[PDB]
């Protein structure tokens, strides 16, 4: 009586979500630099978003935010490169706080 | 006849233009210091890999 790994992968929320393009996700600000919030949203890599000029003080560690994902991982192959160069971070648009 | 009596205005304009050129030179020099050094520093952190790991 054990759920298979295939079952878990099939029924996990990340699999439920289709292509990450323009999907809406709920991220968590797990680390903040002066004006750069590092937001984890459950994906393999976090995203980095500038603190909004409006209510920027309202964003703090653990502040749950809404993001529009453009890519789970930012990668691309370049002229002559054998393997894709990855910046090890997702590309997401910060929409605001969630309550 | 190269006499300053009437040229006063043009000569003053010449001096002002030279001063403006020098000031613009200084401002450009200071403002110049993405620069190639910073861009290359960024690139080195993500080197092109034409071989296999």
Swiss-Prot record, chain A:
Keywords: Acetylation, Disease variant, Mitochondrion, Phosphoprotein, Primary mitochondrial disease, Ribonucleoprotein, Ribosomal protein, Transit peptide. Its main location: mitochondrion. It is found in: Mitochondrion. GO terms for molecular function: RNA binding. Coiled coil: none annotated. GO terms for biological process: mitochondrial translation. Disulfide bonds: none annotated. The modification N6-acetyllysine is found at residue 58. GO terms for cellular component: mitochondrial inner membrane; mitochondrial small ribosomal subunit; mitochondrion. It is linked to Combined oxidative phosphorylation deficiency 47: An autosomal recessive, multisystemic, mitochondrial disorder characterized by intrauterine growth retardation, swallowing difficulties with failure to thrive, hypoglycemia, dehydration, and hepatomegaly. Additional features include global developmental delay with impaired intellectual development and absent speech, microcephaly, facial dysmorphism, cataract, sensorineural deafness, skeletal features, and cryptorchidism. Belongs to the bacterial ribosomal protein bS1 family. Component of the mitochondrial small ribosomal subunit (mt-SSU). Mature mammalian 55S mitochondrial ribosomes consist of a small (28S) and a large (39S) subunit. The 28S small subunit contains a 12S ribosomal RNA (12S mt-rRNA) and 30 different proteins. The 39S large subunit contains a 16S rRNA (16S mt-rRNA), a copy of mitochondrial valine transfer RNA (mt-tRNA(Val)), which plays an integral structural role, and 52 different proteins. This is Small ribosomal subunit protein bS1m. It comes from Homo sapiens (Human). The gene is MRPS28. The chain holds residues 76 to 174 of 187 of the full protein.
From Swiss-Prot, chain B:
A motif (Cx9C motif 2) lies at residues 7-17. Signal peptide: none annotated. One of its GO terms (cellular component) is nucleoplasm. Keywords: Disulfide bond, Mitochondrion, Nucleus, Ribonucleoprotein, Ribosomal protein. Transmembrane segments: none annotated. GO terms for molecular function: RNA binding. GO terms for biological process: mitochondrial translation. It is found in: Mitochondrion; Nucleus. Its main location: mitochondrion. Component of the mitochondrial small ribosomal subunit (mt-SSU). Mature mammalian 55S mitochondrial ribosomes consist of a small (28S) and a large (39S) subunit. The 28S small subunit contains a 12S ribosomal RNA (12S mt-rRNA) and 30 different proteins. The 39S large subunit contains a 16S rRNA (16S mt-rRNA), a copy of mitochondrial valine transfer RNA (mt-tRNA(Val)), which plays an integral structural role, and 52 different proteins. Belongs to the mitochondrion-specific ribosomal protein mS37 family. This is Small ribosomal subunit protein mS37.
């Amino acid at each position: 009586n054990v759920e298979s790994f295939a079952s878990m992968l099939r029924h996990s929320p990340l699999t439920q979500m289709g292509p990450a393009k323009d999907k809406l996700v709920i991220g968590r600000i797990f680390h903040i630099v002066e004006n750069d919030l590092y937001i984890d949203f459950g994906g393999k890599f976090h995203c980095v978003c500038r603190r909004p000029e409006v209510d920027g003080e309202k964003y703090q560690k653990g502040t749950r935010v809404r993001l529009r994902l453009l890519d789970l991982e930012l990668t691309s192959r370049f002229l002559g490169a054998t393997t894709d160069t990855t910046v090890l971070e997702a590309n997401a648009v910060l929409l605001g706080i969630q309550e | 006849e190269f006499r300053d009596d009437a040229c006063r205005k043009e000569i003053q304009g010449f001096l002002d233009c030279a001063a403006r050129a020098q000031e613009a030179r200084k401002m450009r020099s200071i403002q110049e210091t993405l620069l190639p050094n910073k861009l290359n520093k960024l690139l080195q952190r993500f080197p092109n890999k034409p071989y296999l790991s």
